[PDB]
Design an enzyme around this catalytic site. Structure first.
Site, PDB file in Angstrom:
ATOM      1  N   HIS A 160       0.851  -1.175   0.000  1.00  0.00           N
ATOM      2  CA  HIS A 160       0.000   0.000   0.000  1.00  0.00           C
ATOM      3  C   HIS A 160       0.887   1.225   0.000  1.00  0.00           C
ATOM      4  CE1 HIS A 160      -3.301  -2.673   0.885  1.00  0.00           C
ATOM      5  NE2 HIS A 160      -2.715  -3.071   2.001  1.00  0.00           N
ATOM      6  N   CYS A 207      -0.500   1.749  -3.904  1.00  0.00           N
ATOM      7  CA  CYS A 207      -1.825   2.345  -4.035  1.00  0.00           C
ATOM      8  C   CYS A 207      -1.708   3.853  -3.862  1.00  0.00           C
ATOM      9  CB  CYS A 207      -2.781   1.754  -2.993  1.00  0.00           C
ATOM     10  SG  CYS A 207      -2.701  -0.068  -2.830  1.00  0.00           S
TER      11      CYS A 207
END
Ligand SMILES: [Zn+2]
Ligand SMILES: [Zn+2]
Ligand SMILES: [Zn+2]
Ligand SMILES: [Zn+2]
Lengths: 108, 103, 149, 100, 152, 100, 149, 103, 100, 152, 108, 100
Positions: free
Chosen positions: J96, J138
């Site tokens: 992430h 992300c």
């Protein structure tokens, strides 16, 4: 305008001619005329167009380089209206015979 | 793991014009062919593949050159096209030598 | 499936050798042969060819009006040499010619001869290297009328 | 302008003049095998000349004769012969764009 | 100086025409000529050639053992056609052959004939377009012994 | 060493690519290089890898090596764990020609 | 297997449109902002850029020391136009700048603004066509000592 | 058979130097960057892919240019490197229009 | 001569700054999928920059979000971001020659 | 005029070194950090990446959920090495991330750190060689609605 | 030879200098000297080498074009032994300050 | 028309490529284009051809069309000749994410 075949008409097209250093006059004299776009000049006797000139590019030899057949240049008879025919006679390239075996007509 | 290759491979004959035809030549500038050859070599020879290079030499001779013989109209405004019989087996390029190492 | 990289499948000729290679130009302009009128500005071809070639890192060498026998001396010599240290070899020829032949100073000859001095079996220093022959021979006899575009 | 009537031709025939053309009875000729192999592998991607070069490479490198009954014709070699007079690059291009 | 883009100086053949073009394959396998033993698996060449060609967008068409006279009918026809809508044309030939000649079903012939059906003056729809002839002719007579190379 | 089919099989220990016929593959002159799925032929030195889930060992061997002495059925030092097996598995017979 | 030629998978941008496209150069040399010393020969950059661009068939247009508000007028305009007949669009900018900002005649500004006038949703005539922004901004503050080779 | 594409695709920001660094500029010849940019454009712009083109503009700025400030040794013999953040989705080339028809 | 210490770097990260990175739970991220797809397909043949361009093309064209439970995040798009400062052409070349 | 071939003007990176170079993959799937839900099939990215890379002659090496401090150990090490015998180096990261940062097992961090281990002055074995960093973070927060296109 | 740093030594290398048209003298004067290979001249103050000259290529501007930093040319102090220092002082390019934000030292 | 699995099968009349599962292929949204072995999906407009002797219809459909509504299991006008058959044949379930 009593059109381009006349050397007179080929010169009057070089109005607003950029590229100061280059011989506006004699350039137009050898069948060249301004396209009115950058420094692109076109030959009226072979349709060639040439631009981007270095500070020594000579109008004749450079015309010759890009157009090895130009009727005016190789000295064929053409509708050319020479503001000064005697001037041309000296300026033009010598004489280029073309051969393919012998055909005694060169320096025969 | 050992192999063999034709003795007649890797040859290239790029001669002036198609068999059974004339080769045109300006008395004061050289032949159509040599003119176009040199022109391309000193212009691309470094940058370009040999085959495509010669293609453009073909293009030059075919497109840029008419005969122009005003005394002999029968031989006037004539054309010419080179003839590149090839049997190379890999890409020829006139490479140099370059790298740039480290500290 | 997919076969490994044999490297005999080298996509390009190796042209990074110690040096480019030999380049022999054969300039004919005058002939002992009858009716063979001399070649005009065949020299100016030569200069240019020489020029561009040397700029291409070549070892350029030139021979003026050679009697045929001389040509063969010259080739036979060149051929018998250690090309293992050079990328390839090039020969060029300038003169008249008819269908299937080329003229020397004294006689015509089919080039199939010179050709054969360099086959891999007769000249392994060049085995796998490219041999280039360029010709400016009036070779042929018919004219091409062309087509307007 | 005008152009030679004999331009833009390409004759890519099996082997150098005055030589044999080898051919497997149950797989076709050295030449056609290598030809097809390259066409359906590069024909879309590649220039015609370099394409044929690799067809030359294939025929020259990958193929020995193998005739164990006739040792005189055994382990023989072959090399194609591509006499060209094209005046521009041939490519088997498609048609693609994507508008707006 | 620098000359303009004449576009006759087009770097590549235009190959985006309405369609690729015609592709005529001439498969010879049997001969009326004496001593000419039939060609083994000359067909399997054909299939493959056909395959790859059609995958190349070509208009493929094939002719089995053709008497020479037929070949010429076929070419003469093909030649007289409006190729203005196609990129080019290709012909291929499969059979025996000797130095300077190619065999038809009934006779040998120098290809210089077929060649001449497509010159620009005889076939302007293709004037400036590429004409491709591939041959698989045993043409010739000498063998090539080759040369052994360093492992790779 | 490798000339024996037995020895060609024992090299396929730790053979990845489950789906592929380890046995018969080695049987046709192939043996594991012990590196990915690269197998090499001992009778022509060819090496092949990256196999799709249908690539057949013989035809794919043939494709990349059109001359392989073992495959075209020349007599070779091959030590066939099962000579009768080979006799059926091998390609038919490929004669090579050049005129008549 | 093998998927067909979707042509959305076009390998190259289509650059054969009726015309190249617009090319707006923003030349800053003087600033109302304090301490901002004028830019030396930032013009001579401009001439050259103009030159080469026009030689590239572009529709070139230039704007001298623009107050920020003007820039936006200019862009907003350019953006709202039918580019469907042109290959693309290019903008260039010459002036000082710091990390994350660029200076107009009167103020700094993050370029993320101008950027957003051309996204496909805000300017579909260019949707799928390339938008090029070149910057000559002193943007940043640290120096690079380099390494000898 | 209808498809969609990012609104933020096909952008290219090729600005003078890596973030947080100076941009060098000759008072009487223009910036390192513009000099190298123009140099490449009028030299390759027609021939070359946009990305590789810019690469050579990067090469030029990085290799051919030292600062040279003999009054301020602290800013002397300094270096610069451009920064080409790209999100194009196909090859940009400044193509022209050429063909050559028939009789 | 001297060269920037910050040259020859390449950061090719998933999406434009300030945006999401989409990822299939059972096939991996849009980005890695397209990346690998291109590398093992062109990585040998292709320039690094144009290579990545096609990875950009893949992520941008071939991929919608598809989240039928969350229509607000449905049929969404993604575009990579390749900030480069290489100074020459990267290619994953091998080593080949063929001697004499 | 025309300047000589300086070869510092080498058109391409030299990639024929004794070997490709190191390729370190950082696979994050689980996090000590709160609210950070694990990454689904982030592994299957890894396998593929590994695969293709090794097929590219690389020296591939992978690290699972690494606490940030470990990453730095790993890089610092890799960086201090004789790359003079390799074409380059590549690092990849999977996890992430938010705008301007990337997550380790235990914390976020701006990559500007790892970046700086390889600058020519800090790592000359690679001076002039290319360093490649790929990220699947992300990173960011906004969505892209896109635009519909004409059939193709 | 009492080596190249002297303008005198840079001139004596231009013996057998082809390319008639080009100013052998002043060319060597600006740090250039013959490599004795075609028309390749190299600068002793930046190691640049340049060849293939068109019939107008000026030695200074063309030196500048291919070597934007040359210490001699940008007018840094160097071991140059000027056969005529006053000649150089006029021939050399004006003065090129380098900047990166403001640093009032330009036309400050 | 084609939305029915029945109609998707009746298009595979004169279906070449014997080895490939004509039936189940059509079952997963595929139908014959009647041109070589090109099949198109009615649920995403993809078209695929040139199949190797192991290319599986589902995974290969998935490879070239990562979003296909039918395949990722969105609700669509599909008229399943055997709905239970599909339920087992179809890929598992692919969630898409972008942070948590
Ligand atoms: Zn003229
Ligand atoms: Zn074998
Ligand atoms: Zn200097
Ligand atoms: Zn589907």
């Amino acid at each position: 305008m009593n059109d381009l075949n006349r050397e007179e008409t080929r010169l009057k097209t070089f109005t607003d001619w950029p590229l100061d250093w280059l011989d506006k006059r004699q350039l137009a004299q050898t069948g060249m005329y301004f396209t009115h776009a950058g420094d692109k000049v076109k030959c009226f006797f072979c349709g060639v167009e040439i631009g981007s000139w270095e500070q020594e590019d000579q109008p004749v030899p450079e015309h010759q380089r890009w157009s090895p057949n130009c009727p005016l240049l190789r000295r064929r008879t053409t509708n050319n209206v020479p503001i000064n025919a005697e001037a041309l006679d000296r300026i033009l390239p010598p004489i280029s015979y073309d051969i393919c075996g012998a055909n005694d007509s060169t320096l025969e | 793991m050992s192999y063999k290759i034709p003795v007649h491979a890797d040859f290239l004959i790029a001669y002036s014009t198609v068999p059974g035809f004339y080769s045109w030549r300006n008395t004061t500038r050289g032949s159509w062919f040599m003119q176009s050859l040199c022109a391309e070599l000193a212009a691309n020879g470094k940058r370009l593949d040999i085959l495509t290079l010669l293609t453009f030499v073909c293009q030059r001779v075919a497109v840029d050159f008419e005969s122009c013989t005003p005394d002999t109209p029968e031989m006037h405004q004539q054309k010419q096209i080179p003839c590149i019989t090839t049997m190379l087996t890999r890409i020829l390029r006139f490479s140099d030598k370059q790298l740039a190492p480290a500290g | 499936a997919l076969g490994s990289v044999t490297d005999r499948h080298a996509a390009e000729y190796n042209m990074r050798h110690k040096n480019r290679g030999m380049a022999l130009i054969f300039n004919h302009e005058h002939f002992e042969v009858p009716t063979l009128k001399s070649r005009a500005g065949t020299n100016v071809d030569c200069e240019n060819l020489t020029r561009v070639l040397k700029q291409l890192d070549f070892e350029v060498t030139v021979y003026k009006d050679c009697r045929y026998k001389d040509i063969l001396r010259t080739i036979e010599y060149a051929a018998s040499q250690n090309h293992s240290d050079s990328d390839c070899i090039l020969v060029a020829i300038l003169s008249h010619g008819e269908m299937g032949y080329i003229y020397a100073k004294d006689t015509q000859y089919k080039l199939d001869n010179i050709w054969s001095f360099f086959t891999a079996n007769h000249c392994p220093s060049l085995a796998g290297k490219p041999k280039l022959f360029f010709i400016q021979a009036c070779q042929g006899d018919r004219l091409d009328g062309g087509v307007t575009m």
